[PDB]
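Hello again,

I reread your note about wanting to compare the complex against the isolated chains. To keep things tidy I'm splitting this into two emails, and this first one only covers the full assembly. Below are the input lines as submitted, including protein chains and any nucleic acid or small-molecule components. They are followed by the predicted structure of everything together. The single-chain runs will come separately.
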Amino acid sequence: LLKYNVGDLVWSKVSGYPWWPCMVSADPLLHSYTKLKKSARQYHVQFFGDAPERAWIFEKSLVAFEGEGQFEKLCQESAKQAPTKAEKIKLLKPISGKLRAQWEMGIVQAEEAASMSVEERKAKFTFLYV
Amino acid sequence: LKYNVGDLVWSKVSGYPWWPCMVSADPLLHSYTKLKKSARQYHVQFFGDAPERAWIFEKSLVAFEGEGQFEKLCQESAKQAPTKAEKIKLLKPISGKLRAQWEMGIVQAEEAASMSVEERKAKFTF
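Full-complex prediction:
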């Protein structure tokens, strides 16, 4: 019912990627965290992991983050909606390699963040130029 | 395919000016091009002093010949803007930190353009 705010934890879905743990944050060059591409709202997110990536993601590809247990249900619904048999097969491959290691590292960071207050998690996990 | 890894391109992302980029392998997916079918995307790294990367639709990519192309791309994007609000935003001049980083990307892209493919791939791939 409410708009996400800076610091909220979300799952993000990018094509070719498993659902990914993120935090809504302000774009450091645009100084906005939500905007209209003007009727389709996006939010700015940073992707947890070892690499500090960020992106503008459409509202419909974001799901509020409660914990890693949601990942099962998100994947089942992505599979039971995959149009082609070819994408269904790609979705059923257990994630592996550097992709898996970066995703598991992202899950650990997001679960630490989920147990902090918003003001504390913004201080700790916001990417900043260093 | 219209581009190979190491090709310099301009990328259009909503809210951003046309931005100098290099086509590159996604470090996790290992691909540099893919279908989201019949709608091709390419993976790019945005020049500048912080590493950013994205998957961009081919229709939002233009081969990078030189800085002089920018105002041409901007004029064409403004004619095509879906709404007058978006048009007006495209016509406002860039400044502040966004422009400083844009100019950083223009320097590295010209520098990268002035060295061979495998030369540029070595230094600029993060």
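For quick reference: Residues 8-124 of chain B form a domain with the SH3 type barrels. fold (CATH 2.30.30.140).

B.
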